[PDB]
Design a protein around this ligand. Structure first.
Ligand SMILES: NC(=O)c1ccc[n+]([C@@H]2O[C@H](COP(=O)([O-])OP(=O)(O)OC[C@H]3O[C@@H](n4cnc5c(N)ncnc54)[C@H](OP(=O)(O)O)[C@@H]3O)[C@@H](O)[C@H]2O)c1
Ligand SMILES: Nc1nc(=O)c2nc(CNc3ccc(C(=O)N[C@@H](CCC(=O)O)C(=O)O)cc3)cnc2[nH]1
Ligand SMILES: [Mn+2]
Ligand SMILES: [Mn+2]
Ligand SMILES: [Mn+2]
Length: 159
């Protein structure tokens, strides 16, 4: 099973200048809980944005060019990325925009954080078709001293 996990600001913005400009510790904790002990697939730009391997996960990087770091696994196509995960119950696709576009048609589950924040961005989560997806979990949180915007955790499953 393939799942996508992402945090979206208003208008599906996910990034600007190869960064995420907000800081929401509760959402990063949600990301860690839902990805730990699973393989994570990311594109090369997202690898550069994170800047180091994510511990406790098999890190798989898509790039058309040879890898430059043997602490992670480098692959050259979507099918190779999936194969490199092996026989696991759930593969997590962690972006960015170009990678989400390619994996969305193959995904059964979306883990989305909707952040109440207006962000100028240059990268968006794919337009997906709402009729294709059922919301099976949602949890709203007001802003607090640690998290400066309200946010909603949602899990959707392909109908
Ligand atoms: N809010 C969130 O949830 C979230 C999550 C992830 C990322 N982001 C943000 O998203 C942005 C990065 O997204 P992006 O769309 O620019 O880039 P990306 O999807 O991270 O990376 C694209 C790169 O991945 C490689 N690639 C993708 N598909 C491939 C394929 N089928 N075969 C081989 N290589 C492939 C290519 O690398 P080569 O050029 O080396 O061939 C391509 O240039 C950043 O702003 C980041 O902060 C946000
Ligand atoms: N919901 C969501 N939020 C994100 O921030 C996110 N980020 C990415 C890609 N970028 C990043 C950037 C940093 C870390 C990171 O530092 N993660 C630590 C945080 C642990 C914690 O804060 O408790 C990790 O071990 O996962 C992960 C992904 C992909 N999907 C996402 N999905
Ligand atoms: Mn092929
Ligand atoms: Mn197999
Ligand atoms: Mn806000």
């Amino acid at each position: 099973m393939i799942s996508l996990i992402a945090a979206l600001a208003v208008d599906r913005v996910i990034g600007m200048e190869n960064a995420m400009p907000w800081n929401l510790p509760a959402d990063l904790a949600w990301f860690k809980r839902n990805t730990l002990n699973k393989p994570v697939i990311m594109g090369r730009h997202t690898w550069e944005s994170i800047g180091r391997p994510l511990p406790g996960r098999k890190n798989i990087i898509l790039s058309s060019q040879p890898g430059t770091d043997d602490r992670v696994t480098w692959v050259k196509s979507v099918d190779e990325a999936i194969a490199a995960c092996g026989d696991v119950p759930e593969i997590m696709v962690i972006g960015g925009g170009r990678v989400y576009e390619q994996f969305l048609p193959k995904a059964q589950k979306l883990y989305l954080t909707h952040i109440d924040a207006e962000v100028e961005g240059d990268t968006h989560f794919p337009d997906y078709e709402p009729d294709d997806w059922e919301s099976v979990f949602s949890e709203f949180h007001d802003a607090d001293a640690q998290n400066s915007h309200s946010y909603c955790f949602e899990i959707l499953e392909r109908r």
